[PDB]
DNA sequence: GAGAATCCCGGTGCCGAGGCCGCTCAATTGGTCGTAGCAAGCTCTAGCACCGCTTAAACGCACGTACGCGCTGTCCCCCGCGTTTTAACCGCCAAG
DNA sequence: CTTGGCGGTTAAAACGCGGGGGACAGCGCGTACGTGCGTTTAAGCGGTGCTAGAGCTTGCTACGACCAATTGAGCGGCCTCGGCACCGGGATTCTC
């Protein structure tokens, strides 16, 4: 048939998404999430489009920055797969918890 | 003229201001009359910005200046 | 009446709460009770709340 | 409690009777 | 008030983020953890943003509120003002 | 203008007005907005230069934010200056760890 | 309208100085503007704290220079300082 | 002699209020002083930025309250706003 | 005319007038409201009390009747909110929290 | 002879209770002046300044050693190695 | 060569307070390097503050300001 | 050596970058003057240098065992991919 | 300028399954580091003279806010166009 070795097209995905600059998280459900979280602080909020775009940029930047440190925490433990403990350690050293 | 409105001086029966039931005791943190422990639970976990609106509905909010 | 329906339905009511519709609620759903402190304290009991309660739709 | 009941909610609280009534809760319907 | 939306951050999206972050292999328990972290993050940001909105006595959260929130949180964001 | 008298492109007058308000100090020096506008013009020049080169490498003539990100992150000093700064529509630098490269 | 201003025209001029045949998009321009404003607030703030620490109620070019020496790392500082001392010299050659 | 002010007597009074039978070392005194100074600079700074953001030239109690809501976390902020409101109300009443 | 302090009228201990002066001559704004000094003094006094209380507790734990920097450190690093407030703050002569990982414990 | 690990834990319990400085005073002073002699000639140092430098230095080093130890344990090891320090510094955003 | 003044058992003690059971041999030199860089930055900023104040004696407040501007506020020395 | 799958190249539809223009309000020009800042002058806190000395501590080293580290078999859990289910995306007029 | 809502699309998200590369527990050779005692370096001690230089004070004076007159620099706004996103045939380069 036509198969590919596990870890090849994933690496190609890394090289492709690192080259691109467009946003990754889907816009509409993220906006829905933002509006869902905001309803615990002020009832009936209105949002500028630029505000939601800013929140999405900051969030994706934060997460993509965290995934690097996570990946480093995974390689430090002689592994290639990221694990929850790697995220925990990353955020711990980062000074968040 | 227009100064014929008169206040009172008498004991007032203080009712609840979350519900309408008669309530016998208030709070130190938020100063709300309340009926029983369910209303006390809903008072102590209400989102901020509303514990002042109950005193706004009852009066004497005393908002900042 | 508008303030108490705004604070009763606490988590957000999906509906325009005008003043005039609360006035028409007051016009046909309010009556001065004869003996207030006895009527009030046993009003929200479960036995018979279905006939005290008055309910209002919205489109 | 299941072993005791086998061996042997909203209807308790008044806030559901105050907001909604003796009928059960709102299932987030249209009307 | 809608339903859930924490599941809106779907699996392939988190996978994409990991790809841009340079991750070859991802665990299964990564996604829920990421949803939690993102939830905490967005909470911390939106709280301060809404605070700035309330101090301005506005009912509409502007972009500048988000920018101020991020800046005072220690993550300055360019391309929106400030 | 004071910008022309100092050979600067950035507005000395506007910088002086901004320093006047904003509650920084009581009175503001006369050479202070000149110096400040000069520094801003220098930094602007450096970033726009490096980003221009980055745009040239991508066969583009209009600088996109991606070029700005590439310029800043490829300069340790500029990266240090903008360490806690997130550039919108900038992406990340291409970086794949050595142990992630295919083997066997 | 209220005439919302920025550092647009100046950034464009300097861009055409360092690169005559190179343009810039709107988003990148906004980012450059935000950068200029950020550095401005940082330098002016540090200068303000400098003046306040020494019980002096004036932000002269000295406080600005020290602020640059504190903020900008390495060569970026050096060059900047030079570009400052140059400017403030020329301003004193035609005033 | 040039007298230098400090928050010593005040934190001492507070100490006597909360713990009448405990003492305080000079080092810890200076630490508490630096603490109060730091928070003062923080809240006042954030309040200043708040006033500047809304084109206002006056820092009222509202700006201070919002600043405290932004800086102090959770229940600490709640009790802080509580004590602040009590104090400003009692001050408003007693002329 | 029988003067009284603004701190006494506000029912506080921290100096209201001093805080007001610092706000005025601190380059924060052109004008400052009358509620700002009493509010700020109240917040500072409250935070002061919250630290001194836990510090007194930690002092009592070490059988000492004088609060030392160590007691302040133990007070702040245990209170999560206070710790977050002073996360980028180093307390001199305060040491660290006694914390040993489970892996390093004897087998 | 104790088994190799007991004395180490005893030292950990010993120094986690203490608060006094660990690095010797005079060598640290000599190091401070050696590093300072490349910025300003014939520098005079206040004793409190050197003490502050040492307090902050030891605090920073201990804080880094905690994270380093965490990196060591994360790799299923009970020994800190330069890789751990470099990783800690990297995540903290210093390297 | 005063960086060797910071001795091996001193770094060991600091590691103990940090909660470290076993220490490698390559740790000490690394620690000396990190401390050297940290002190370089802090003292650089401090001397900058000193020279701005037209003084030839770096005070404790200069150290406090330098540490504060690096995001490492220090209580117990003023400020 | 088969098979995708990036890259390259010539063509084309499109909209945002760039230049012009009306014109408003902020920068410039210019003079008084309160005063912060320069600055010489002067008191004295405090930093620097250092002679010898008890000794804690750094250093040096031998013995050895817990531990870093390479090797390895086995359970298993993500990877890749086709199919199927689902909602994000888009146009876009319209209430407020 | 944000919000609602058709309905129409289709790429993206879900579900499922074979299976291959990797997490992970077990084991063993070996060396790097811990523990303890002897040798040795110099930190810590204090004694205090010397004086640099921080700190304060008074006097002189040059700096900059401040009101006022006023003109163009700069922002909002309009429009032709060319960089660039788009698009599809085919070069071609990694992969298995």
From Swiss-Prot, chain A:
What's the family? Belongs to the histone H3 family.
Q: Which GO terms describe its cellular component?
A: extracellular exosome; extracellular region; nucleoplasm; nucleosome; nucleus
Coiled coil stretches, renumbered: none
Function as written in the Swiss-Prot or TrEMBL entry: Core component of nucleosome. Nucleosomes wrap and compact DNA into chromatin, limiting DNA accessibility to the cellular machineries which require DNA as a template. Histones thereby play a central role in transcription regulation, DNA repair, DNA replication and chromosomal stability. DNA accessibility is regulated via a complex set of post-translational modifications of histones, also called histone code, and nucleosome remodeling.
Q: Does the keyword Ubl conjugation apply?
A: yes
Query: Phosphotyrosine-modified residues are where?
Result: 4
- N6-crotonyllysine modifications at: 19
- N6-(beta-hydroxybutyryl)lysine is found on 19, 42, 85
Q: Which residues carry this modification: N6-succinyllysine?
A: 19, 42, 85
Give the quaternary structure: The nucleosome is a histone octamer containing two molecules each of H2A, H2B, H3 and H4 assembled in one H3-H4 heterotetramer and two H2A-H2B heterodimers. The octamer wraps approximately 147 bp of DNA. During nucleosome assembly the chaperone ASF1A interacts with the histone H3-H4 heterodimer (via C-terminus of H3); this interaction is direct. Interacts with DNAJC9, CHAF1A and CHAF1B. Interacts with NASP; NASP is a histone chaperone that stabilizes and maintains a soluble pool of Histone H3-H4 dimers.
- Decide whether keyword Acetylation is in the record: yes
One GO BP annotation of this record: chromatin organization
What residues bear N6,N6-dimethyllysine in this entry?
42
Gene label: H3C15
Q: What is the protein name given in its UniProt record?
A: Histone H3.2
The modified positions for N6-methyllysine read 19, 27, 42, 85
In-chain residues carrying the UniProt-annotated modification Phosphoserine:
20, 49
Question: Phosphothreonine is carried by which residues?
Answer: 43, 70
Q: Where is the lipid attached (S-palmitoyl cysteine)?
A: 73
Curated annotation (Swiss-Prot), chain E:
What's an example of a GO molecular-function annotation for this chain?
DNA binding
Where in the sequence is N6-(2-hydroxyisobutyryl)lysine found? 11, 24, 39, 57, 59, 71
| Section covered of the full-length record | 22 to 103 of 103
State the gene name recorded for this protein: H4C1
N6-acetyllysine modification sites are 11, 71
Presence of keyword DNA-binding: yes
Q: Which GO terms describe its cellular component?
A: CENP-A containing nucleosome; chromosome, telomeric region; extracellular exosome; extracellular region; membrane; nucleoplasm; nucleosome; nucleus
What's the name of the protein? Histone H4
Swiss-Prot/TrEMBL puts the cross-link Glycyl lysine isopeptide (Lys-Gly) (interchain with G-Cter in SUMO2) at 11, 39, 59, 71
Residues bearing PTM N6-succinyllysine: 11, 57, 59, 71
Predominant subcellular localization, coarse grouping? nucleus
Quaternary state and interactors: The nucleosome is a histone octamer containing two molecules each of H2A, H2B, H3 and H4 assembled in one H3-H4 heterotetramer and two H2A-H2B heterodimers. The octamer wraps approximately 147 bp of DNA. Found in a co-chaperone complex with DNJC9, MCM2 and histone H3.3-H4 dimers. Within the complex, interacts with DNJC9 (via C-terminus); the interaction is direct. Interacts with NASP; NASP is a histone chaperone that stabilizes and maintains a soluble pool of Histone H3-H4 dimers.
Location of the protein in the cell: Nucleus; Chromosome
Q: Which GO terms describe its biological process?
A: chromatin organization; negative regulation of megakaryocyte differentiation; nucleosome assembly; protein localization to CENP-A containing chromatin; telomere organization
Tell me where in this chain the PTM Phosphotyrosine is found: 31, 68
**Which positions bear N6-lactoyllysine?**
11, 57, 71
Positions carrying N6-butyryllysine: 11, 24, 57, 59, 71
Q: Phosphoserine-modified residues are where?
A: 27
What does the UniProt entry list as the effect of changing residue 11 to R?
Abolished ufmylation
Which part of the chain holds the cross-link Glycyl lysine isopeptide (Lys-Gly) (interchain with G-Cter in ubiquitin)? 71
Q: Which residues carry this modification: N6-propionyllysine?
A: 11, 24, 57, 59, 71
Q: Which residues carry this modification: Phosphothreonine?
A: 60
Carries keyword Cell inner membrane?
Answer: no
Q: For this protein, what post-translational modification is recorded in UniProt?
A: Acetylated as part of spermatogenesis progression prior to histone-to-protamine exchange.
Curated annotation (Swiss-Prot), chains G, H:
Question: Is the keyword Manganese in the record?
Answer: no
Tell me the residues on which N6-succinyllysine occurs: 4, 86, 90
Q: Which residues carry this modification: PolyADP-ribosyl glutamic acid?
A: 5
Q: Which residues carry this modification: N6-methyllysine?
A: 16, 78
Where on the chain is Phosphothreonine found, per UniProt?
A: 85
N6-lactoyllysine is found on: 13, 55, 78, 86, 90
Post-translational modification N6,N6,N6-trimethyllysine, affected residues = 55
- Posttranslational mods: Monoubiquitination at Lys-4 (H2BK34Ub) by the MSL1/MSL2 dimer is required for histone H3 'Lys-4' (H3K4me) and 'Lys-79' (H3K79me) methylation and transcription activation at specific gene loci, such as HOXA9 and MEIS1 loci. Similarly, monoubiquitination at Lys-90 (H2BK120Ub) by the RNF20/40 complex gives a specific tag for epigenetic transcriptional activation and is also prerequisite for histone H3 'Lys-4' and 'Lys-79' methylation. It also functions cooperatively with the FACT dimer to stimulate elongation by RNA polymerase II. Phosphorylation at Ser-6 (H2BS36ph) by AMPK in response to stress promotes transcription.
Q: Which residues carry this modification: Phosphoserine?
A: 6
Covalent cross-link Glycyl lysine isopeptide (Lys-Gly) (interchain with G-Cter in ubiquitin), where? 4, 90
For the modification Dimethylated arginine, the affected residues are 49
Keywords, in A-Z order = Acetylation, ADP-ribosylation, Antibiotic, Antimicrobial, Chromosome, DNA-binding, Glycoprotein, Hydroxylation, Isopeptide bond, Methylation, Nucleosome core, Nucleus, Phosphoprotein, Ubl conjugation
N6,N6-dimethyllysine: modified positions: 27
Q: Which residues carry this modification: N6-methylated lysine?
A: 86
UniProt keyword Ubl conjugation, yes or no: yes
Which residues are annotated with the PTM N6-malonyllysine? 86
- List residues modified as N6-crotonyllysine: 4
What GO MF annotations does this protein's record show?
A: DNA binding; identical protein binding; protein heterodimerization activity; structural constituent of chromatin
Q: Tell me, in one coarse class, where this protein mainly resides.
A: nucleus
GO CC terms of this entry = cytosol; extracellular exosome; extracellular space; nucleoplasm; nucleosome; nucleus
What's this protein's family per the entry?
A: Belongs to the histone H2B family.
Q: What is this protein called?
A: Histone H2B type 1-C/E/F/G/I
Q: Which organism is it from?
A: Homo sapiens
State the encoding gene: H2BC4
Q: Which residues of the full protein are shown?
A: 32 to 126 of 126
Curated annotation (Swiss-Prot), chain I:
- Where, by residue number, does the polypeptide cross the bilayer? none
Keywords assigned: Acetylation, Chromosome, Citrullination, DNA-binding, Hydroxylation, Isopeptide bond, Methylation, Nucleosome core, Nucleus, Phosphoprotein, Ubl conjugation
Residues with PTM N6-crotonyllysine: 25, 107
Coarse class of the protein's main subcellular location:
nucleus
* One of the record's GO cellular component terms: nucleus
Q: Where is this cross-link: Glycyl lysine isopeptide (Lys-Gly) (interchain with G-Cter in ubiquitin)?
A: 2, 4
GO BP annotations, alphabetical order: heterochromatin formation
> Where N6-glutaryllysine occurs, residue numbers?
84, 88, 107
Q: Tell me where in this chain the PTM N5-methylglutamine is found.
A: 93
Task: Tell me the domain of life.
Answer: Eukaryota
N6-(beta-hydroxybutyryl)lysine, modified sites: 25
A GO molecular function term, named singly, is:
DNA binding
- How is the protein altered post-translationally, as described in the entry? It is involved in the initiation of both imprinted and random X inactivation. Ubiquitinated H2A is enriched in inactive X chromosome chromatin. Ubiquitination of H2A functions downstream of methylation of 'Lys-27' of histone H3 (H3K27me). H2AK119Ub by RNF2/RING2 can also be induced by ultraviolet and may be involved in DNA repair.
Give the coiled coil ranges.
Answer: none
Question: N6-succinyllysine-modified residues are where?
Answer: 84
N6-(2-hydroxyisobutyryl)lysine modified-residue sites: 25, 63-64, 84, 107
Where does it localize? Answer: Nucleus; Chromosome
Q: What does this protein do?
A: Core component of nucleosome. Nucleosomes wrap and compact DNA into chromatin, limiting DNA accessibility to the cellular machineries which require DNA as a template. Histones thereby play a central role in transcription regulation, DNA repair, DNA replication and chromosomal stability. DNA accessibility is regulated via a complex set of post-translational modifications of histones, also called histone code, and nucleosome remodeling.
Task: Please tell me what else the database record remarks about this protein.
Answer: Describes the first characterization of a ubiquitinated protein.
Family that this chain belongs to: Belongs to the histone H2A family.
Q: What is this protein called?
A: Histone H2A type 1
Q: What's the source species for this entry?
A: Bos taurus
Parent sequence residues shown: 13 to 119 of 130
